[PDB]
Symmetry: D2
Subunit: 423 residues, 4 copies
């Protein structure tokens, strides 16, 4: 029965063509949904009660569109998101962190950092936002200007550059090099370049981000008809599935959740599609290609990450449990696209929110009392990942897990991979 | 010899990549498509696309197959649509070197619960035979006996009509192999399929059916809501353009328009948009792995047509051939070339007007209808048809003097004897 | 039938990986195909008798090597005459006649920088006696090949020059030597003295790989069956060396003292024949063809385009043979570079091309002697029927077999452009 | 270039010119052949073990010391010739030569002792002389038995039974010498510790032109099973009388290593020849050149694809450690082992990195020479009070011995493989350490 679920007959195929031939509508997804859902907050999704339903439906990142609304409006949206999120903190083994992302208005008619963006970026730092979706990035100096406007207090906010025009596509490599990730902003991109070429830019950018090991977001009109209708079109469900199959780390909802009549249903639909598409991923070729393309490295976190992903595939590990301070060790595991869930146990509330940008990373915020012996404290965090995993359905007694830790406290010392039997 | 500019167009840098990941990384929005669009466009005929003048614009925009939906309208209404299509098509027939055939496909109403065919389907299928339709899109096919029922209804005069089974429910998906075995091809009818099975599972059924049809070498059509928003808006959504591109990248032979052309406000623009997207997606196909996998999955064969087809496709890839010119009576030799997915256009020269319309079902097949009287010496008649394909290709932009073409012929007249592949330099 | 798929290592041929291919190799799976790696036998006191040369031709000798390091011009002219007499004794039956090439192996430059005066005299002797191939000793650079070419003069333009790589400089300047040569000989004897003995296998494997990539003949030579000079059976290392030279990709394998002076010249030829046949069936064509296709650049030459189409068609139907019409041997060489499992039966009117194509693996030359028919299409057809009748008599073909036929659109060399699928009746 | 660019800037272009690294990074096997370079020097320690047959030419203690220094890892006693008194003296001389370098782990080289049986002859099962010779082996503490003419699984069971309850630790390597042994190979391999391709008898029992097919098939199946395979007979035959081998002989040794053999053997070359030490030096020189020419890119991918999924943590850790070693070009994989099993599971994936096996078992240290790329280190210190400290001391012993022996250098990355509790069978940890 195990080998009939999660498209495992299609996963064992020797060619991609045979993999397609073996895809089965009756093979149910079992693994937890890996691709994060970004939902835009607006009039249709601002209330605390609505936000609680959206968190339960699968929203991982709340997007604030600073093209509309005042700072007072956005501060209220932030407070409502935090209130809805913290209402589930009473059960620490099932609490779900939710990131807050600020989407800038943009440079507009000018080719420089606007005065409104400088004010909005400062608002973001003061309100503790986790991510900035920087609009209309056309070159590396645009990313540097956003970074500078965040100042010294905003040093830890992730900058996701939105590629929205021909220049951004042509200067992609230099933009990606200085960004934390990319958003394929298809709305403006489809007006700036011929509509029939947007899919080439999406596929190229997803491929280059996967190669770089940096998050990529697919955005705009994914479930557009759901703004007024309860069910999406056949093109819309295929678009969501294909963004996941292309290699996108995150999928986004704009008007569907910000102003539409069915915000919760749009989140549920993206969750349902992503789960089905993730099981249909051809890991046999994907992992070998990512493994071949990632350069040789002498960084122990990089070396441990490939060893752990290889070990997970060998035993069909239910999960890879990793301890992380900044999220980096979890991101390096994520870049190889394991079928095994990457359960990231962290003390940092910000890192727990930010790792939603990386596909297959399930953040757990550790809030248990400390152990006096560091080695005992490490083991306790590892057991916490196992208990949360058991409660959430990721793990069962008898499962094998890969555990990734470091040799000394502090960030940057991951170097150990262990094979653990559950209970 | 070819120039550096040649290797920058039609995603040739991405085509040379050693891995699919590197192929994605090398896709370029500035690399322009050069080859003729190979995925056929099926447009549904209705009030918005019925007039002769509107049909002429749709033919110019790229419509290859006209679909008549027998769920609506009387036999008198459909006979008028057929006559208007034929009048618009024949208005360009004055130039045999330029003439574009257009197939006519009848889409049945369906069984609507009950064994065998409905009485309305028997009557509509008989109308199709009497009006010389090329294809039947058979609704709600659930098993092999449903196809046998459609085949029996095609009377004594309609055995040459192609039956494309529409898979619209869970049973059709589960009994897919037995349905494909007895059908000429398949339509992934996503509208009903999305109501019969969970909406989030339709993409798995589409990808599986396209894969199995590609492996079997049989035509597969992707249908319903591909450019839905274009029924009222002049431009499609980002999800819609991606859906068309991904149907082509999945391996679909045909793409379809329903309400977009039958009742919408922008029928010609919907055809133009599908044409524009398909051209871009076809150049982005990763032929290196696709050909290798079709080659590996296809079993060994002692059929000379099948053996010649793989030799010709391999030869076309070796020289970047502008085209593969094939002589065919039934369309079979062109279909066997098509199954290996050559980048080269397959120019099919035929004397059969029906085979010229029906080969639009096979991706990359460009039919040319040959109307010259037969030569007394067969070898001369073969050479005259080969030169007709070269001169049509020159007129239409496929070929230039100095280009290499692959020519596929047989050793004697009649269908079933294809066994020769020649490499010709265009003079 | 099921029996067909149990022979010629076909279960190992279908394997998805090289490791699974090794695991499926079967000592009970008998070789069926004709032996495709040519055997070069050195002529000497043990193999100069016309009657003994007839036995070596029957055992499988394809090329007779004359080592100009020993013997006078008078001695070598006698070797040539005895070889030709033994070869021509089978000309009375044209359907089974086997051409045999004559190769002149030069003495070398010695302490000198360029072509020695003895080499200039020996090369002129070769042209005057109509030799087919020159194995040029101690080639160190492209100018050494040009000097050999110049010494052959205007009448020796058709002689093939196979450069012997025998020292470190020849290995380092390999690419420039291969570019101007017709092929290469891995002359392991001198190479093993010039460079450390434990490195010779790297130079052999590299040179075979680069020659296979270039589509040019490569000969593996020296001490392949050395112990058979005095013993009737070779050592386990010797049989493995022959098998591995074939698996590496060598077009030809050579015998030196084993046939020139040993007590078992005919048996040494039979042993090389037996091993090569076994090794050729064990070749992993699935990866080999894929890699040769991938490494070969795009081409606008119709002979080259037809060749890959014909090899792909032959693999699709398990063709028993690819029958090709050739004047210079080039169309057969372009088929050979893709390493088809199907035998390449080359029909030619050129006696020299029939001898020279033995340098290309899997090419079986047939010398056609009939004067041209008035209708060119009938002349082409009579040659293809000759290839079929020769193949049927020799065991290559049976009724019901599929064959790929490669021809051109007009008479003369350089116009191959047609591939046809034929059923043997 | 982008997949090696940063590592090329760090380690330098000279690093990437040695050990056939340009041929190693080729995308196809054809390009790998084209890039093989006679000027690319081998850097890694020789990983294929050399088995040398002991006889009149190689029996003296002083000669055995030179053979150990030249590279002999396993001493073979051929029980087809000589009395029990002769063989006991050969064993004592081997042990004396081996123990003469025992003052430090930087000079110590464990050498296994293998007993090669006379065989069944015309009889169906185990002969009475074999029963007596096998009991002699147990009484004299031999590490391995090369069982002659194994034709079926019951033949190996009979050898195992003749070793008795005290010889359960002895490894049984079945010699495949005839057609029946080849046809019943799978059942023989299943119950054996490894296989010897005994080409001498095999070449008389089956056509000589078919021996290479049997050798290649058996090596491939042993590699797939993860069990040792020995290539034997006439590898450097002419070196019995000549100081240099023939071109066929050097190619045969190189090709046995490229086929996947764990061990290569010398018979008359060391037992009775005029150049026993030179024969060992020649096999050592060829094996190092051939090991660097192995195409690890496809070999690792295929071993990975053919190996089934596993829930054994030692097996799961082994593939993770080999993958980690390839990622950083690790100088070594240091593994703690009691029976040798954890080192054998690393060895089956054919890492380019040396597998340094730290053990307290003198027998396991001798027996791991059967597995390609395993370098045994015999740990002699008494156990620490705290088990975790004892483990750490053994790992540091491997690092310090590795540095002083040239295997490791400052700045190198090493992969360390250990378990979660004492005792055999609990390996489950892989660590990445930087050498300081
Ligand atoms: N890095 C990556 C590796 C592998 C994949 S993949 O999903 O396995 N991938 C699907 C597309 N191709 S294809 O050549 O177009 C093809 C399409 C259809 C066919 O029938 C066929 O035979 C080949 C095969 C490979 C990735 N997807 O995103 N990133 C990927
Ligand atoms: N288990 C094993 C796995 C992989 C290898 S390998 O070294 O990577 N390798 C061997 C040679 N072959 S080939 O198909 O004969 C070939 C030969 C020549 C060619 O030019 C070519 O393109 C292909 C390619 C694969 C092994 N070698 O011994 N055991 C091996
Ligand atoms: O992914 P990051 O940011 O490098 O964090 C990984 C770090 O987490 C740990 O596993 C545990 O460290 P702490 O005890 O400081 O939480 C370290 O050993 C390791 O260096
Ligand atoms: O694709 P089909 O229907 O088999 O037709 C291919 C046939 O066309 C030809 O090339 C030309 O035949 P005709 O002269 O009868 O048209 C035949 O030699 C070949 O058998
Ligand atoms: O291999 P080559 O030397 O190019 O010879 C091939 C030539 O042989 C032919 O098949 C037959 O030519 P001939 O009639 O002159 O012998 C030509 O059509 C073709 O050009
Ligand atoms: O390779 P083997 O025989 O399984 O030995 C591996 C064992 O060695 C260890 O690393 C150390 O164990 P000991 O302390 O008993 O020597 C164990 O944790 C592990 O189970
Ligand atoms: O701003 C956006 O998200 C866009 O343009 O797609
Ligand atoms: O009938 C159709 O085309 C459908 O249901 O999609
Ligand atoms: O000359 C030769 O043939 C040699 O040196 O091997
Ligand atoms: O016994 C042996 O070693 C042999 O026969 O090779
Ligand atoms: K915005
Ligand atoms: K209908
Ligand atoms: K000479
Ligand atoms: K013995
Ligand atoms: Mg925008
Ligand atoms: Mg329907
Ligand atoms: Mg020489
Ligand atoms: Mg023996």
């Amino acid at each position: 029965a195990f080998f009939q679920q999660q498209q495992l007959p299609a996963a064992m195929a020797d060619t991609f063509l045979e993999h397609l031939c073996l895809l089965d509508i009756d093979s149910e997804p079992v693994a937890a949904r890996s691709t994060s859902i970004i939902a835009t907050i607006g009039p249709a999704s601002r209330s605390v009660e609505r936000l609680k339903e959206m968190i339960k439906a699968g929203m991982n990142i709340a997007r604030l569109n600073f093209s509309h609304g005042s700072h007072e409006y956005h501060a209220e949206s932030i407070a409502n998101v935090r209130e809805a999120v913290e209402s589930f903190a009473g059960s620490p083994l099932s609490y779900r962190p939710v990131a807050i992302a600020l989407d800038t208005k943009g440079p507009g008619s000018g080719p420089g950092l606007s005065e409104q963006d400088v004010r909005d970026l400062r608002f973001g730092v003061e309100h503790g936002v986790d991510i900035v979706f920087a609009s209309f990035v056309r070159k590396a100096s645009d990313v540097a200007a956003v970074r500078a406007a965040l100042g010294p207090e905003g040093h830890g906010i992730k900058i996701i550059s939105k590629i929205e025009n021909h220049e951004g596509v042509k200067r992609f490599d230099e933009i990606l090099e200085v960004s934390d990730g990319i958003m394929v902003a298809r709305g403006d991109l489809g007006i700036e370049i011929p509509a029939e070429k947007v899919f080439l830019a999406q596929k190229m950018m997803i491929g280059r981000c996967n190669l770089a090991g940096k998050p990529v977001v697919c955005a705009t009109q994914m479930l557009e008809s759901m703004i007024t209708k309860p069910r999406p079109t056949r093109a819309e469900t295929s678009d969501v599935a294909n963004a996941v199959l292309d290699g996108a780390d995150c999928i986004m909802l704009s008007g569907e959740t910000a102003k539409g009549n069915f915000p919760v249903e749009a989140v549920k639909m993206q969750h349902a599609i992503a789960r089905e598409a993730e099981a249909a991923v051809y890991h046999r070729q994907l992992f070998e290609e990512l493994r071949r393309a990632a350069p040789l490295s002498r960084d122990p976190t990089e070396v441990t990450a490939i060893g752990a992903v290889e070990a997970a595939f060998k035993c069909c590990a239910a999960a890879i449990i990793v301890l992380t301070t900044t999220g980096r060790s979890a991101q390096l595991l994520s870049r190889y696209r394991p079928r095994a869930a990457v359960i990231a146990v962290t003390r940092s509330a910000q890192a727990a929110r930010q790792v939603h940008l990386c596909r297959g990373v399930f953040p757990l915020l550790y809030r248990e009392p400390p152990e006096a012996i560091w080695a005992d404290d490490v083991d306790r965090r590892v057991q916490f990942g196992i208990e949360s995993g058991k409660l959430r359905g990721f793990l069962r007694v008898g499962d094998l897990v890969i555990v990734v830790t470091g040799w000394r406290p502090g960030s940057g010392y991951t170097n150990i991979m262990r094979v653990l039997s559950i209970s």
